[PDB]
């Protein structure tokens, strides 16, 4: 993800090299080019306009027009604007004494495999996780998480067909007490679209289990639809943070860039492969530097 945009931002910056100091009109040209690059990456007009305005202000504050290397000033101000757009400071969930967390999202989002890779990440950090396969319609969606829990050495509780939220709560509390579980990761059901009985069911489970966090797992390769999905889940269920998967995929990147400010939720993790190990903390500085061709490729 972000190939064309990364190329197009780098090319805009590169066009400023070797020319001496630049003029006001030269700066305006570069700024429209950044705005176009963003919009071609599917950033909407308002977010792209805000981004460019930030770059303009910052670059003028660094006296870009008086620099012998204006490309470097633009690189720095684009970098920072990208970092800020992606969230600024890296963030994660608060771990406290009791940690019960929902993973929500659509079919194909990376939800179930993210649950398992999350289980493993936290086990490696000294937590003691329990995975809950919470689709009460589909034995095979539950199964799938079972075999991923075995892979990663993290225990699993599968809900029964049609199980009530109160029984789930009981069986989960019983197992958590018996097994000393101190991070319960609830893999809510995945469908192809927003199943409305689905959203209601999920809201009821949420009222009953009272999760500390509700993590919505979004496939980055699906585009602007992701931010509509985010709004829908936040309004029908209520979500506390994001995970963006398939950032290793080939796709534009503009919605991901816009997600922090559009959804108002932190991005805690990004999935970077199909493997259990392929989910790591989301580091706004790292994707931003990367996008601009700095650091480790
Ligand atoms: N390349 C890549 N593939 C991913 C990533 N996360 C998940 N996938 C893949 O996406 C597909 C969908 O996974 P997932 O959504 O977890 O399972 P599912 O079978 O659709 C069930 P649900 O969506 O309800 O969790 C799987 O093939 C999985 O390997 C990622 O970060 N990168
Ligand atoms: Ca209710
Ligand atoms: Ca280098």
């Amino acid at each position: 993800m972000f190939q064309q945009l990364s190329a197009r931002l780098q090319e805009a910056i590169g066009r400023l090299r070797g020319r001496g100091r630049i003029t006001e009109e030269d700066l305006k040209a570069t700024l429209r080019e950044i705005r176009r690059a963003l919009m071609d990456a599917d950033v909407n007009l308002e977010v792209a306009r805000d981004f460019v305005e930030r770059v303009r202000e910052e670059a003028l504050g660094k006296q870009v027009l008086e620099s012998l290397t204006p490309a470097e000033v633009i690189l720095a101000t684009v970098y920072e604007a990208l970092k800020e757009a992606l969230g600024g400071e890296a963030r994660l969930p608060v771990l406290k004494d009791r940690n019960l967390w929902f993973l929500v999202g659509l079919q194909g989002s990376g939800k179930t495999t993210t649950a398992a890779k999350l289980a493993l990440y936290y086990k490696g950090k000294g937590r003691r996780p329990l995975l809950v396969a919470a689709d009460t319609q589909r034995p095979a969606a539950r199964e799938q998480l079972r075999l991923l829990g075995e892979k990663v050495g993290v225990p699993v509780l599968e809900v029964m067909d049609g199980e009530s939220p109160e029984s789930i709560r009981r069986r989960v509390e019983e197992k958590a007490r018996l097994e000393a579980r101190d991070l319960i990761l609830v893999d809510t059901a995945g469908r192809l679209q927003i199943d409305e009985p689905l959203m209601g069911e999920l809201a009821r489970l949420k009222e009953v289990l009272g999760p500390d966090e509700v993590l919505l797992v979004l496939d980055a390769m699906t585009g602007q639809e992701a931010l509509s999905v985010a709004r829908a889940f936040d309004e029908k269920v209520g979500v506390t943070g994001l995970v963006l998967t398939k950032l290793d995929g080939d796709a534009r990147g503009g919605a991901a860039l816009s997600a922090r400010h559009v959804t108002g939720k932190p991005i805690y993790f990004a999935g970077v492969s199909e493997k259990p190990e392929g989910l790591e903390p989301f580091y706004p500085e790292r994707l931003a530097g990367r996008i601009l061709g700095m650091g480790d490729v």
Side-chain angles (χ1 to χ4, degrees), residues 67-92:
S67 179
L68 292 172
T69 54
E72 303 305 318
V73 179
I74 296 297
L75 171 67
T77 55
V78 175
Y79 159 77
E80 298 286 359
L82 283 170
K83 176 186 163 182
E84 179 180 54
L86 290 165
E89 184 174 13
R91 294 189 53 180
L92 292 170

Side-chain angles (χ1 to χ4, degrees), residues 93-205:
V94 168
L95 290 162
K96 39 191 175 264
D97 179 56
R98 292 294 81 184
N99 308 285
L100 190 155
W101 298 353
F102 277 24
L103 297 89
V104 312
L106 303 185
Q107 216 172 310
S109 61
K111 175 181 55 59
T112 293
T113 57
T114 292
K117 293 179 193 190
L118 259 184
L120 185 53
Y121 173 81
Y122 282 106
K123 184 182 182 188
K125 298 311 188 189
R127 306 307 300 199
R128 297 199 199 278
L130 170 63
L131 283 160
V132 180
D135 193 328
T136 61
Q137 289 76 37
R138 300 188 183 180
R142 302 190 299 252
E143 282 166 355
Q144 181 191 40
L145 181 53
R146 183 195 311 184
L147 295 186
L148 302 174
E150 198 180 0
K151 284 184 171 161
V152 304
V154 167
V156 187
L157 192 284
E158 299 150 43
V159 298
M160 293 177 88
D161 289 342
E163 197 165 14
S164 76
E166 295 82 1
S167 177
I168 294 177
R169 180 172 60 189
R170 182 188 42 90
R171 286 208 294 118
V172 175
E173 283 172 347
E174 176 181 41
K175 188 181 175 73
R177 171 189 41 101
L178 285 167
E179 307 183 13
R181 307 293 89 190
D182 70 6
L183 179 70
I184 302 308
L185 294 152
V186 184
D187 183 4
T188 65
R191 304 291 171 267
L192 291 164
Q193 309 173 195
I194 297 170
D195 189 78
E196 195 64 25
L198 196 76
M199 300 312 287
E201 166 180 42
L202 174 56
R204 177 60 179 165
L205 190 72

